[PDB]
Design a protein around this ligand. Structure first.
Ligand SMILES: CC(=O)N[C@@H]1[C@@H](O)[C@@H](O)[C@@H](CO)O[C@@H]1O
Ligand SMILES: CC(=O)N[C@@H]1[C@@H](O)[C@@H](O)[C@@H](CO)O[C@H]1O
Ligand SMILES: [Ca+2]
Ligand SMILES: [Ca+2]
Ligand SMILES: [Ca+2]
Ligand SMILES: [Ca+2]
Lengths: 229, 229
């Protein structure tokens, strides 16, 4: 279906739903909470989602957002993701599950209905993933289907970074481009039929989780979808 | 192989190779020439290409540029493309061939070695293309393999638009995202093994052609390529 929205900053959160530990702070979406001294709270997850559902049948889409990861140590955890899921999709487990999965079913593709691009600051040995920080595409599992190294220089830059995520509904390809100013650029593409996974309604949004020594902030976000008929 | 470059504008055109009717103008790359009255010169093609060749084996890349199409009537032609080809690729035919193909072989995939994302302002009936203006991915042929409608409101906007083109060397997928400020967004992705098409060196750059009543300008451009080992 056709849907467009645009938040050049989050001085407005008019259409945004906040769940779990996520909140509007400093004209951004703050995905996980901080205490009254500004310290990241461990073992929390939160979602900030566009409130209105849409459909993916015969649809392409483009979305872009800017974000900052603020770390207070060289061992931050756990990262955040942009995700698509059904509209009743709740905030799930904190830690390495990134608020997107339940421990009992995290790697079971038949038990999950969620597609995400993840920015993973913490190397987990509880399931298969790279030995370094990484950006990944996730289809129904915490074990990414396509993954690439995320350079520490970019991770710790404190820069406002940009992501572009698009879906070509004809070729059934999900793509992410991630860029840092005067820094690294990242490209991941993966063939996945989103309409098959999601034959009804979906909502798009962000999920972050701790972990430790890390807060994740979205600073802007826009989106457009169009019919491929 | 690994190559990066960055032109925040074209105050300098050092390491750009120009051919045909393309030249440096007012801190831009002007793809096709204008006459002493400022009027687009009909039936001209030009290339502006980065000078340093690179290799595609086990390589991913990201490129972005901004551009303007200047039309002087409601019947502009022909458009421009970003393209990859061997480094001795010459300027080819003007008009709907976009500077990229010769008439006798333009639709014969075995007779060409060029891949492009094209911005096509002129619907040609001399071969198969859509009945409206369109953005396309071309693989060895002027008949695009993937095409999407390009809205006339964007075409004629006179805005500074942005393109992002990426290649995922693991999945072998070329993707374009094109964006207009308060305008349309476009997404195309296609599977193509660029290292198989181009076993040796290649350059990346632009090709524009007239046509009539149109000049194409590139205002900024950056590129990075990284190994997939
Ligand atoms: C499985 C799991 O969530 N593991 C988490 C890991 O993701 C990270 O948050 C870590 C920081 O001390 O704490 C746990 O080990
Ligand atoms: C095959 C070919 O190039 N056809 C051109 C067309 O692309 C456009 O330039 C037009 C402008 O009037 O003239 C036609 O002759
Ligand atoms: Ca991961
Ligand atoms: Ca992890
Ligand atoms: Ca065309
Ligand atoms: Ca044409």
């Amino acid at each position: 279906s056709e849907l467009s929205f645009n938040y050049p900053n989050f001085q407005s959160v008019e259409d945004i739903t906040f769940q779990g530990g996520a909140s509007p702070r400093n004209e951004t979406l703050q995905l996980t909470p901080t205490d009254s001294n500004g310290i990241p709270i461990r073992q929390r997850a939160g979602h900030a989602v566009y409130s209105q559902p849409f459909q993916l049948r015969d649809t392409s889409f483009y979305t872009t957002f800017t974000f900052v990861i603020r770390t207070t140590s060289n061992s931050p955890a756990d990262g955040f993701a942009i995700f698509i899921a059904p509209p009743d999709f709740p905030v799930k487990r904190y830690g390495g599950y990134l608020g997107l999965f339940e421990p009992n079913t995290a790697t079971n593709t038949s038990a999950n209905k969620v597609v995400a691009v993840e920015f993973d600051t913490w190397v987990n040995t509880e399931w298969k993933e790279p030995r370094y920080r990484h950006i990944g595409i996730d289809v129904n599992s915490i074990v990414s289907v396509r993954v690439t190294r995320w350079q520490d220089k970019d991770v710790f830059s404190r820069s406002i970074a940009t992501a572009h995520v698009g879906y070509d509904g004809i070729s059934k390809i999900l793509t992410a481009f991630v860029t840092y100013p005067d820094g690294g650029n990242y490209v991941l593409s993966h063939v996945v039929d989103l309409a098959e996974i999601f034959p009804g309604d979906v909502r798009i949004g962000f999920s972050g989780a701790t972990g430790q020594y890390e807060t994740q902030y979205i600073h802007s976000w826009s989106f457009s979808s169009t019919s491929t008929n």
